[PDB]
Write a protein that holds these residues in place. Sequence first.
Motif, PDB file in Angstrom:
ATOM      1  N   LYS A 226     -19.328  -1.586 -76.739  1.00 35.88           N
ATOM      2  CA  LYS A 226     -18.555  -0.812 -77.717  1.00 35.88           C
ATOM      3  C   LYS A 226     -17.229  -0.306 -77.162  1.00 35.88           C
ATOM      4  O   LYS A 226     -16.309  -0.012 -77.927  1.00 35.88           O
ATOM      5  N   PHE A 227     -17.128  -0.215 -75.837  1.00 41.75           N
ATOM      6  CA  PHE A 227     -16.039   0.544 -75.210  1.00 41.75           C
ATOM      7  C   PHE A 227     -15.173  -0.238 -74.212  1.00 41.75           C
ATOM      8  O   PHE A 227     -14.124   0.248 -73.799  1.00 41.75           O
TER       9      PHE A 227
ATOM     10  N   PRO B 125     -12.428  -1.818 -72.518  1.00 42.19           N
ATOM     11  CA  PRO B 125     -11.030  -1.498 -72.842  1.00 42.19           C
ATOM     12  C   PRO B 125     -10.235  -2.629 -73.485  1.00 42.19           C
ATOM     13  O   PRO B 125      -9.314  -2.339 -74.249  1.00 42.19           O
TER      14      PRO B 125
ATOM     15  N   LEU C 273      -8.594  -6.354 -65.006  1.00 42.30           N
ATOM     16  CA  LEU C 273      -9.694  -5.561 -65.550  1.00 42.30           C
ATOM     17  C   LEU C 273     -10.975  -6.388 -65.619  1.00 42.30           C
ATOM     18  O   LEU C 273     -12.062  -5.905 -65.291  1.00 42.30           O
TER      19      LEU C 273
END
Lengths: 111, 111
Positions: B45-46, B48, B9
């Motif tokens: 904020k996001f 993963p 990722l």
Amino acid sequence: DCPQDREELGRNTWAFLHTLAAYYPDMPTPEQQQDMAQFIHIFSKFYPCEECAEDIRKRIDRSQPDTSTRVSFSQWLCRLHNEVNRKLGKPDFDCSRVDERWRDGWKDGSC
Amino acid sequence: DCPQDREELGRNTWAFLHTLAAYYPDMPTPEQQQDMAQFIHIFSKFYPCEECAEDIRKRIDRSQPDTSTRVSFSQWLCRLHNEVNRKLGKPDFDCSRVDERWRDGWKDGSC
Ligand SMILES: Cc1cc2nc3c(=O)[nH]c(=O)nc-3n(C[C@H](O)[C@H](O)[C@H](O)COP(=O)(O)OP(=O)(O)OC[C@H]3O[C@@H](n4cnc5c(N)ncnc54)[C@H](O)[C@@H]3O)c2cc1C
Ligand SMILES: Cc1cc2nc3c(=O)[nH]c(=O)nc-3n(C[C@H](O)[C@H](O)[C@H](O)COP(=O)(O)OP(=O)(O)OC[C@H]3O[C@@H](n4cnc5c(N)ncnc54)[C@H](O)[C@@H]3O)c2cc1C
Ligand SMILES: [Cl-]
Ligand SMILES: [Cl-]
Ligand SMILES: [Cl-]
Ligand SMILES: [Cl-]
Ligand SMILES: [Cl-]
Ligand SMILES: [Cl-]
Ligand SMILES: [Cl-]
């Protein structure tokens, strides 16, 4: 270790995006629903895709990202990805297997 | 064909972000600057990887992205990535080679 061509950057970006959606909250607050929508809009304005057949700017303003839930967002992103698949002659990905592919691993245990 | 682990990722997301910066305008409008700032803020904020996002949020709130130019933003992103490198025990990336690495290719036609 050379610059990403369209194919390589695509592969990077789908991996990032689908993983983003896979771990998006099942029950996002309104503010999160709005941050994710906004994020996808800004993404559509900056993604490098010179002379791409997919007009993702227009696409994201017509079929707007649905960020109500993890599964909504996941499915919306899968449909988007399939629109690009169709233009490029790649087969449709079965959107019902989006969690196996990007979060949980295929049911056959090979992950 | 399996879900991204933390390392996979990561590799994909940096590729995506450095490339994003590499194709960011030399002289972006005030609105593009603000959009990219907001993009990065929501990204933080996001992202993963839970541990990873809390970490970058605190690094980003410490030094907000300089989205003034392709150069400022690319360099800012290089420095951010070098902080994660340091924390992880990986070598420092010479930020003066960033345009070559993600945009133009090595000056020696290696790409
Ligand atoms: C927003 C965006 C727009 C793009 N527009 C263009 C364009 O206009 N023209 C162009 O040539 N390239 C475009 N690309 C790049 C292109 O889509 C591919 O990434 C590239 O061609 C590499 O293809 P690939 O065969 O390696 O698989 P990719 O399409 O990159 O897919 C990687 C993996 O994702 C999984 N996957 C495939 N479809 C879905 C789906 N529907 N839902 C969930 N997972 C799926 C599959 O496991 C696949 O192996 C775009 C990429 C992005 C992110
Ligand atoms: C925002 C973010 C936060 C992360 N937080 C964590 C974390 O907290 N803990 C954790 O374990 N992992 C974290 N990761 C993942 C981690 O940074 C790496 O991506 C992963 O460890 C794989 O590293 P790698 O050695 O393959 O190279 P990567 O660090 O993934 O880099 C990929 C390639 O980019 C180039 N590159 C390297 N450094 C730079 C630079 N500074 N500027 C420009 N190009 C460069 C190199 O050519 C390298 O081969 C994070 C990733 C991201 C994107
Ligand atoms: Cl609001
Ligand atoms: Cl917000
Ligand atoms: Cl928009
Ligand atoms: Cl806009
Ligand atoms: Cl737009
Ligand atoms: Cl708009
Ligand atoms: Cl990978």
